């Protein structure tokens, strides 16, 4: 395996045995390629200003295909409003995330900590998701996912709801932030919208959220595309 992939396997845990454990094809993305430049732009432009504790710096970019995930995502790949969005988590979770995919809290679990109910959460501001890696100066390396999310018809909300059931015809929730990546800069990679614009005012002022959130309540609406290794500089 390429050295970057070996260092990734060591981060989240011999090597080839654990790699097969992940049930995931992992490939290194060329630094000089356009995938990489699009991703680095996304990172650079969507760093919120209230998250000035750290600067982000991309170390490695991996293209990942989880086993079965594309065959499971099928019914939503034609779904309009597909979007490439961040998801952060503690390094410890990633072994599981890759082997089993992003999951939903169990049906009988408290909803009080879930601003928009028990679903799978995403941001379009890199720092908003990077906050959920919970890295520090003692461990300034973390992992963020980029997922293709089949948002469909969004239920746009300004305030928490704490339930997991959508109205009919809705497929996702968008928590509306006061700040959103400039839509005039969105680009379409492989049919999927990448909101890599610099943050500008959304025009919403009646809202609880500084930045957007995107929630889906079916694990088949997610197709993990990339995994970034980030250095946090505090
Ligand atoms: C060890 C461990 C334990 C637990 N319980 C969790 N989960 C939560 O604390 C939790 C619960 C509810 C919502 C969200 C949440 N995530 C995001 C993200 C993201 N992720 O980029 C992006 C935008 C909005 C978000 N809202 C997170 C995570 C980890 C690593
Ligand atoms: O579509 C998958 C997922 O969407 C949910 C809500 O998240 O329901 C939506 O999609 C259904 C299938 O098209 C629609 O019938 C429904 O009207 C719509 O809200 C879930 O039911 C489902 O797991």
UniProtKB/Swiss-Prot annotation:
Transmembrane segments: none annotated. Changing residue 90 to A: Increased affinity for DNA damage sites. NAD(+) binds at residues 87-89, 96, 103, 129. Promotes AIFM1-mediated apoptosis. This form, which translocates into the cytoplasm following cleavage by caspase-3 (CASP3) and caspase-7 (CASP7) in response to apoptosis, is auto-poly-ADP-ribosylated and serves as a poly-ADP-ribose carrier to induce AIFM1-mediated apoptosis. Changing residue 96 to S: Does not affect DNA-independent poly-ADP-ribosyltransferase activity. Changing residue 51 to A: Strongly reduced serine ADP-ribosylation, caused by abolished interaction with HPF1. The gene is PARP1. Changing residue 107 to G: Does not affect DNA-independent poly-ADP-ribosyltransferase activity. It comes from Homo sapiens. Changing residue 95 to S/L: Increased DNA-independent poly-ADP-ribosyltransferase activity. This is Poly [ADP-ribose] polymerase 1, processed C-terminus. Changing residue 51 to E: Decreased polymerase activity, leading to the production of short poly-ADP-ribose chains. The lineage of its organism: Eukaryota, Metazoa, Chordata, Craniata, Vertebrata. It is found in: Cytoplasm. Changing residue 218 to G: Abolished interaction with TIMELESS. Changing residue 211 to H: 14% of wild-type activity and increased branching 15-fold. The active site is at residue 213. Interacts (when auto-poly-ADP-ribosylated) with AIFM1. Residues 14-234 form the PARP catalytic domain.
């Amino acid at each position: 395996l390429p050295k970057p992939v070996q260092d990734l396997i060591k981060m989240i845990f011999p090597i080839d045995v654990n790699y097969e454990k992940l049930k995931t094809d992992i490939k290194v993305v060329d630094r000089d390629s356009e995938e990489a430049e699009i991703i680095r732009k996304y990172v650079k432009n969507t760093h919120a200003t209230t998250h000035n504790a750290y600067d982000l710096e991309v170390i490695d970019i991996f293209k990942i295909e989880r086993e079965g995930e594309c065959q499971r995502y099928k019914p939503f790949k034609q779904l309009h409003n597909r979007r490439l969005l961040w998801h952060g988590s503690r390094t410890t979770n990633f072994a599981g995330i890759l082997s089993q995919g992003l999951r939903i809290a169990p049906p009988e679990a408290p909803v009080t900590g879930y601003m928009f109910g028990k679903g799978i959460y995403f941001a379009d501001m890199v720092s908003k998701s990077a906050n959920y890696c919970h890295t520090s100066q003692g461990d300034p390396i973390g992992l963020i996912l980029l997922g293709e999310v089949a948002l469909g018809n969004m239920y746009e909300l300004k305030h928490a709801s704490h339930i997991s059931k959508l109205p009919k015809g809705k497929h996702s929730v968008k928590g509306l932030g006061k700040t959103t990546p400039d839509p005039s800069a969105n680009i379409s990679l492989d049919g999927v919208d990448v909101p890599l614009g610099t943050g500008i005012s959304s025009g919403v002022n009646d809202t609880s959220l500084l930045y957007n959130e995107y929630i889906v309540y079916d694990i088949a609406q997610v197709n993990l595309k990339y995994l970034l290794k980030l250095k946090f500089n505090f």
